[PDB]
Ligand SMILES: O=C(O)C[C@@H]1CCC[C@H]1C(=O)c1ccccc1O
């Protein structure tokens with residue numbers, strides 16, 4: 001197959017989706033075929049659609065969903081509220097394996113943080129990454145609290161031998177402060193900081209987003225993700 | 228010895244200090260002798276003194292600290308700004324071991340979350356808990372994202388055989404709301420929820436706080452801590 005990457009984060013609202021669009025845009029501009037999947041989408045009752053947003057920002061057409069729930073909560077609660085079930089583990093693995101192919105980068109976008117339950121019983125994105133032998137890209141903030149959350153996440157990945165593909169700061173303030181500056185320097189000391197997206201990148205139009213995306217990542221690292 | 232409990236949380240600003248004071252107060256009202264150790268304090272430029280909050284809210288007098296940095300950052304960053312080092316590992320562990328005595332509940336308050344660096348070099352509250360054979364009480368929020376952060380923290384504890392003494396929700400909203408109510412039920416499936424402190428409790432006077440605290444925790448669980 002090709003390269004499967006799960007895109008996770010230290011928690012909710014850290015920039016997972018915009019980072020997914022940014023890595024997809026960068027990989028597209030390097031000539032890499034990209035597919036993005038979203039095993040579980042909540043918040044559809046308020047218009048949440050991360051796949052649609054990645055298509056808008058990065059131009060990705062190969063977009064695959066599975067489970068969708070209206071309420072903007074964790075999947076187990078949103079499914080329960082709606083009278084619906086979580087998907088099974090093998091259904092998520094099938095969604096991913098159907099997309100995987102040589103020379104393609106398949107990004108698997110999580111819901112919330114790494115240990116969020118996506119399938120019964122207690123099946124998380126970490127288990128899925130083990131199942132499809134994927135590495136994990138971790139989206140982080142630069143805010144107070146971030147190193148503890150980043151270190152807990154990286155420890156949880158290592159516990160199941162899921163490789164860490166690096167960190168991406170989802171929103172980077174221009175200009176930064178003492179805490180943001182100290183955290184980025186300390187984040188870079190615990191793992192590779194692949195990128196740091198400028199604040200408000202999600203508002204950029206397609207052309208500015210593609211320019212930001214290409215500038216945001218090291219063109220050489222993106223190319224090395226998939227032969 | 229007695230019983231040593233570290234009081235950690237899933238992050239910063241989750242209610243660690245007010246929970247420390249709530250458990251101290253509940254334990255004092257059950258006739259238990261309570262000491263609180265806060266090895267490292269930051270934010271002293273704006274007046275942060277967590278040991279003083281425990282003193283006033285719960286009446287604890289055995290209040291032990293080692294270092295105080297002016298900047299409201301993590302310890303390592305506040306030390307870096309001040310141009311001085313953090314305490315040494317032995318200082319923290321020996322201070323706690325000296326505090327511990329039979330009949331006593333010694334609560335150890337970290338800074339920020341569980342893997343925050345407290346001592347030299349890169350020593351955490353989790354290491355401290357291993358060294359003094361303490362269990363860990365985990366302060367959590369009810370907000371969106373709390374289950375992930377809770378599971379992350381509890382795995383990191385089990386990974387070093389530090390026992391989990393339960394959760395406390397540092398701030399329980401009124402009225403709850405869908406997400407907060409869903410989160411409390413889910414937290415209870417992860418570990419015992421020992422208390423959920425009413426929102427605003429940090430601002431109560433000492434007599435109102437001791438009332439809230441005595442009702443917040445289960446009598447038998449507190450009485451059995453020592
Ligand atoms: O993916 C995100 O973090 C943003 C989404 C948008 C709607 C609520 C967030 C969500 O899904 C979520 C939040 C906490 C725990 C598990 C979750 O799945």
Ligand SMILES: O=C(O)C[C@@H]1CCC[C@H]1C(=O)c1ccccc1O
Pocket residue numbers: 144145148238239240241243269270275298299300301302337338339340343
């Ligand atoms: O204890 C708290 O979380 C509140 C304090 C008050 C001033 C900054 C907070 C702090 O200490 C802190 C923040 C991030 C990481 C580690 C830390 O130790």
